[PDB]
Design a protein around this ligand. Structure first.
Ligand SMILES: *[C@@H]1O[C@H](CO)[C@@H](O[C@@H]2O[C@H](CO)[C@@H](O)[C@H](O)[C@H]2NC(C)=O)[C@H](O)[C@H]1NC(C)=O
Ligand SMILES: *[C@@H]1O[C@H](CO)[C@@H](O[C@@H]2O[C@H](CO)[C@@H](O)[C@H](O)[C@H]2NC(C)=O)[C@H](O)[C@H]1NC(C)=O
Ligand SMILES: *[C@@H]1O[C@H](CO)[C@@H](O[C@@H]2O[C@H](CO)[C@@H](O)[C@H](O)[C@H]2NC(C)=O)[C@H](O)[C@H]1NC(C)=O
Ligand SMILES: *[C@@H]1O[C@H](CO)[C@@H](O[C@@H]2O[C@H](CO)[C@@H](O)[C@H](O)[C@H]2NC(C)=O)[C@H](O)[C@H]1NC(C)=O
Ligand SMILES: *[C@@H]1O[C@H](CO)[C@@H](O)[C@H](O)[C@H]1NC(C)=O
Ligand SMILES: *[C@@H]1O[C@H](CO)[C@@H](O)[C@H](O)[C@H]1NC(C)=O
Ligand SMILES: *[C@@H]1O[C@H](CO)[C@@H](O)[C@H](O)[C@H]1NC(C)=O
Ligand SMILES: *[C@@H]1O[C@H](CO)[C@@H](O)[C@H](O)[C@H]1NC(C)=O
Lengths: 328, 39, 228, 35
């Protein structure tokens, strides 16, 4: 499920004007376009952090794991964070972070990259919540789900053995408690063999994380079709601003540069409208993901096909680039 | 005394540690009825 | 009953104190008006733009320029104002889609929490949803989510089942706890200890299949009334 | 149906419930208690 989008800020004097001409005085003839575009873009940038704060910041207490790890034969080594890696992620979330190929700004230094669209006035704002904080929200949710059950999402954290917690959660689907306590080793081995096949199913078929690749592909395609409209002349003599002043003369220079300015303003309005539509799609997806988190991770839902295909027992969240991955 | 603008790392919350054990459960003895406003 | 009624009245009386202060409680209803008023004030301010013409006023163009050259600049204002109206209508359609997506959630909440009880976690409050009370609001709705928040926890020693006569005794709707010496049966959400009898537990299997089983005597209400 | 101790349960004394009504509970053992 996608959660967040790449935040973009657009400068008018570097995109419409060529940042070295006197056409900024002609840009004030149109008026309050850029204020409305920057207000809509900052609203989208605020909503992209509000979506992450609604999805991942469910609890207010950061729960930790015990040092000795025995939960009745169950092996949570693929969802618990690995202390050997410096990112403090799990063994599954590293595979989720190495499959989404986005432009990470973690490089210290600053033949050109795809970030050369900043020179055309298209910057990228970093999110408020870093990946190391999403990985700590996910760890605090997992250390509450394993150690407490549903009690950490409805009040105070009440501890319970995990063999008794799964026997509690079997009663919610219509199965008595005697089936677990006589077949606990088979249940633990089935859970381990099902968690071990998750990483094998993610290291194949190359399309398991396509919903998080499509949003990055759309964010790249919108910027590409925004920087490709700068070479269009919109019916004028050229797409170069000073070449119109050097070729022709004042009376017919403004009849040939307003056709470029209005076209670039229309392309910017189209980009803002498409980003606003995509922001509504991602807001609906983030509301669905927050409802799924609250109803499957923080409890047990009796709904059919809401928390997986079958009778839902438990769900585990995983930190993903620009999204979230559930283990149903 | 001296009010100024300060920058800090965003705190995620309090650090809690649930005392998990093989033979320890927690059952409450009281309750609290709270009204939550949703607009 | 009186403690529950006193807590319910004291939880209602704090909503008045929380809504009389802090100056930003009804922000989501204020932003709906503040966005429409801003989109209208942007619409009245884009009429002062010339859009490449010599004047923004439509009256001092036809009395200034001749029928032919007046057109070139009347169309420059017409295609600018039509584009502004199109942008306003598109943003109003997006805002109407947002208000529709919020009103559908409000209608489903009014259906599932006011007209009934919802088992969904954190759908109608942080806790166990007991009731929901809607109130009238300008351009919106306000729900009062009565919840059940547990407090004053106490930790005991638990066990999966009880070995009485070589048989496994699993609880029906409870859980076994121990205060150090004895063992009881207790509800999952409130501490109410009871004697482990044959009516609270059921028999399934033997004493060597359950990992972590303990030894205790399982009572029965028949054999006291059968020996005498 | 008749209150027959299988449809109800016992919890505490009858002095804390506000609005209790005195009635009988039919134990289904004592008619069949020949021994
Ligand atoms: C939990 O599962 C992991 C993954 O299968 C186990 O780690 C493996 O343990 C074997 C046994 O020594 C090693 O040969 C592998 O190299 C380990 N793999 C990795 C990726 O570390 C782990 O032992 C399991 N833990 C428990 C308690 O069952
Ligand atoms: C655990 O609970 C049992 C039952 O409530 C306690 O046993 C009672 O203790 C009181 C006080 O000593 C006596 O007056 C009762 O006669 C006891 N009843 C029975 C049936 O034995 C027991 O003391 C508690 N243990 C601890 C450590 O609190
Ligand atoms: C519960 O009671 C059973 C007996 O009913 C205990 O089993 C005995 O354990 C001792 C110690 O190993 C053996 O010497 C006996 O032969 C066992 N008896 C039987 C019948 O198997 C059991 O250990 C008790 N469990 C606890 C936790 O006290
Ligand atoms: C229910 O039964 C109890 C016990 O029979 C009643 O309590 C008695 O009430 C009478 C009349 O007030 C008194 O004279 C007795 O002293 C009471 N006895 C006891 C043990 O308290 C009670 O009034 C009955 N309630 C109803 C509604 O009929
Ligand atoms: C800033 O400059 C310093 C030294 O010039 C360099 O070490 C550092 O990497 C630079 N940081 C960025 C983000 O460019
Ligand atoms: C039991 O509860 C007490 C009081 O909350 C607490 O101090 C203690 O650490 C708890 N012990 C365990 C093992 O949970
Ligand atoms: C639970 O049992 C396992 C296996 O005997 C043990 O390693 C672990 O320390 C136990 N947990 C506690 C809290 O004693
Ligand atoms: C529960 O809390 C209320 C209010 O704090 C108090 O009056 C009551 O005595 C408490 N009950 C118990 C059993 O602690």
């Amino acid at each position: 499920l996608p959660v967040s989008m790449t935040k973009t800020s657009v400068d008018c004097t570097m995109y419409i004007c060529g940042d070295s001409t006197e056409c900024s005085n002609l840009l004030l003839q149109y008026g309050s376009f850029c204020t409305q575009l920057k207000r809509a873009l900052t609203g989208i940038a605020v909503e992209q952090d509000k979506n992450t704060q609604e999805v991942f910041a469910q609890v207010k207490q950061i729960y930790k794991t015990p040092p000795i790890k025995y939960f009745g034969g169950f092996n949570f080594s693929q969802i618990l964070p690995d202390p050997s890696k410096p990112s403090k992620r799990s063994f599954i979330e590293d595979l989720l972070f190495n499959k989404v190929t986005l432009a990470d700004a973690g490089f210290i230094k600053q033949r050109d990259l795809i970030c050369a669209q900043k020179f055309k006035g298209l910057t990228v704002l970093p999110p408020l919540l870093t990946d190391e904080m999403i990985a700590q929200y996910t760890s605090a949710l997992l250390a509450g789900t394993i150690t407490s059950g549903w009690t950490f999402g409805a009040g105070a954290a009440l501890q319970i053995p995990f063999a008794m917690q799964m026997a509690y959660r079997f009663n919610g689907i219509g199965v008595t408690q005697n089936v677990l306590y006589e077949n606990q080793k088979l249940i633990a081995n089935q859970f381990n063999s099902a968690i071990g096949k998750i990483q094998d199913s993610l290291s194949s078929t190359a399309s398991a994380l396509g919903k998080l690749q499509d949003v990055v592909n759309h964010n790249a395609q919108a910027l590409n079709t925004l920087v490709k409209q700068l070479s269009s002349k919109f019916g004028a003599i050229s797409s170069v601003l000073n070449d119109i002043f050097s070729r022709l003369d004042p009376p017919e220079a403004e009849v040939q540069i307003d056709r470029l300015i209005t076209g670039r303003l229309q392309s910017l309005q189209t980009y803002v409208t498409q980003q606003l539509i995509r922001a509504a799609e991602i807001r609906a997806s983030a509301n669905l993901a927050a409802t799924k988190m609250s109803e499957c991770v923080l409890g047990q839902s009796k709904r059919v096909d809401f928390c997986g295909k079958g009778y839902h027992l438990m769900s585990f969240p995983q930190s993903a680039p620009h999204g979230v991955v559930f283990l149903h | 005394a001296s009010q100024s603008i300060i920058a800090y790392t965003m705190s995620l919350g309090a650090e809690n540690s649930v005392a998990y054990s093989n033979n320890s459960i927690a059952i409450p003895t009281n309750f609290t009825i709270s009204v939550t406003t949703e607009i | 009953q009186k403690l529950i009624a006193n807590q319910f009245n004291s939880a209602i009386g704090k909503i008045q104190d929380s809504l009389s202060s802090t100056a930003s409680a009804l922000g989501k209803l204020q932003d709906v008006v503040n966005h429409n008023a801003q989109a209208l004030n942007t619409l009245v301010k884009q009429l002062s733009s010339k859009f490449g013409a010599i004047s923004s006023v439509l009256n001092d163009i036809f009395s200034r320029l001749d029928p032919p050259e007046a057109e070139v600049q009347i169309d420059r204002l017409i295609t600018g104002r039509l584009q502004s109206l199109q942008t306003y209508v598109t943003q109003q359609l997006i805002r109407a889609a947002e208000i529709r997506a919020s009103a559908n959630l409000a209608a489903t909440k009014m259906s599932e929490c006011v007209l009934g009880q919802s088992k969904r976690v954190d759908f109608c409050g942080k806790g166990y949803h007991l009731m929901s009370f809607p109130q009238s609001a300008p351009h919106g709705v306000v729900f009062l989510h009565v919840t059940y928040v547990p407090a004053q926890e106490k930790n005991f020693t638990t066990a999966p089942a009880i070995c009485h006569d070589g048989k496994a005794h699993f609880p029906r709707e409870g859980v076994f706890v121990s205060n150090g010496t004895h063992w009881f049966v207790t509800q999952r959400n409130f501490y109410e200890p009871q004697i482990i009898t044959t009516d609270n537990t059921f028999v399934s299997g033997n004493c060597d299949v359950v990992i972590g089983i303990v030894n205790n005597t399982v009572y029965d209400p028949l054999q006291p009334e059968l020996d005498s």
